[PDB]
Amino acid sequence: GPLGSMNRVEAARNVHIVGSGDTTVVLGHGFGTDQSVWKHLVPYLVDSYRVLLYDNMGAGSTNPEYFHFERYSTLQGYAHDLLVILHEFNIRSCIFVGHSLSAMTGAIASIIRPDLFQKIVMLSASPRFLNTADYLGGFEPADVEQLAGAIEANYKSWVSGFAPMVVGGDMDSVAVQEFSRTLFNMRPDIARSVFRTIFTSDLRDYLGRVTVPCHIIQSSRDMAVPVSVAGYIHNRVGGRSVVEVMNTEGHLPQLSAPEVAIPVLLRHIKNDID
Ligand code: NA
Ligand code: NA
Ligand code: NA
């Protein structure tokens, strides 16, 4: 076009910067939401930190200028793309806050460029949802197939079932409406392919290679993440770590229980493991 080079990758990530400081906080979001999931955290960071937010896992893919690039077929490709973001935006070190599988994309990226990560703060993280005989991820095959439900048959129907289950609490809540809203900003074919990536991804083998400090935070009552997952990550990471299980419900507690989750997140961002 006449305004310049069509930068479609740039458009998919939608990198936004707010605040200022010597340290950059990078905020990654989980499947079904976008950078707006951090609306209650960001106002309490901007005084002290530069904050970089970006979108991923097919977020905002109904925007007709969004293209689902081939890199986005795997979580490793998301990790690669995160490293490119860090390079392009001149991040020499950062505090990486990753919600859900973005905690793992951050972890994978940190194995490659540990120099770029001061620490990882994981929120509602899992290295794998599907159970094995020896690993409790929280899902049997029947659960995965139920949760998938009408995702490609009837997206609109699936979303009304999916959103309240993941978020927890009541259907009419601002959080469920927000999650539903962001789910509708996803092209249904892209939501389907990312859903399948999410539920077939097994990142447990990466954990031992992680060396940067990891703060491991989750809700006690998360339908997607048993309480034992936090301890699993804690026992297997290769560097310093700490766990904080919050007396909250839901997979998106930063959106649905900010009164409890925000103060916990801020403590883990601002204070280092000794
Ligand atoms: Na580091
Ligand atoms: Na350890
Ligand atoms: Na340790």
**The three-state (H, E, C) secondary structure of the chain, written as one string:** CCCCCCCHHHHHHCCEEEECCCCEEEEECCCCCCHHHHCCCHHHCCCCCEEEECCCCCCCCCCCCCCCCHHHHCHHHHHHHHHHHHHHCCCCCEEEEEECCHHHHHHHHHHHCHHHEEEEEEECCCCCCECCCCCCCCECHHHHHHHHCCCCCCHHHHHHHHHHHHHCCCCCCHHHHHHHHHHHCCCHHHHHHHHHHHHHCCCHHHHHHCCCCEEEEEEEEECCECCHHHHHHHHHCCCCEEEEEEEEECCCHHHHCHHHHHHHHHHHHHCCCC
Please give the distance, rounded to the nearest whole angstrom, from the Cα atom of residue 117 to the centre of ligand 1: 4
User: 């020499």: which residue's tokens?
Assistant: 92
Using alpha carbons, select from 126, 106, 127, 124 the residue that is nearest to residue 204.
127
Using alpha carbons, select from 200, 191, 159, 177 the residue that is nearest to residue 75.
200
User: 């996803």: which residue's tokens?
Assistant: 186
Name the closest ligand to CA 119.
1
Going from the N-terminus, what domains does the chain have, and what CATH number goes with each? Answer: 1-274 (3.40.50.1820)
User: Residue 78 and residue 205: Cα distance in Å, rounded?
Assistant: 17
Q: Which two tokens stand for residue 234?
A: 């804690």
61 is catalytic: no
Please give the distance, rounded to the nearest whole angstrom, from the Cα atom of residue 29 to the centre of ligand 1: 21
222 is catalytic: yes
Using alpha carbons, select from 226, 213, 183, 249 the residue that is nearest to residue 30.
183
Using alpha carbons, select from 42, 203, 24 the residue that is nearest to residue 117.
24
Experimental technique behind these coordinates = X-ray
Please give the distance, rounded to the nearest whole angstrom, from the Cα atom of residue 94 to the centre of ligand 1: 8
Resolution of the deposited coordinates, in angstroms?
2.0
User: Residue 188 and residue 156: Cα distance in Å, rounded?
Assistant: 9
Q: Are 53 and 16 in contact (CB under 8 A)?
A: yes
274 is catalytic: no
Please give the distance, rounded to the nearest whole angstrom, from the Cα atom of residue 237 to the centre of ligand 2: 6
Name the closest ligand to CA 212.
1
Name the closest ligand to CA 118.
1
User: Residue 32 and residue 162: Cα distance in Å, rounded?
Assistant: 10
120 DSSP β-pair partners: 96, 214
User: Residue 82 and residue 88: Cα distance in Å, rounded?
Assistant: 10
Distances (CA, A) of 206 to 118, 170, 209, 247: 18, 36, 6, 28
Q: How many Cα atoms sit within 13 Å of 49 on the Cβ side?
A: 22
User: What are the two backbone dihedrals, phi and then psi, of residue 217, each rounded to the nearest 5 degrees?
Assistant: -120, 135
Q: Are 75 and 197 in contact (CB under 8 A)?
A: yes
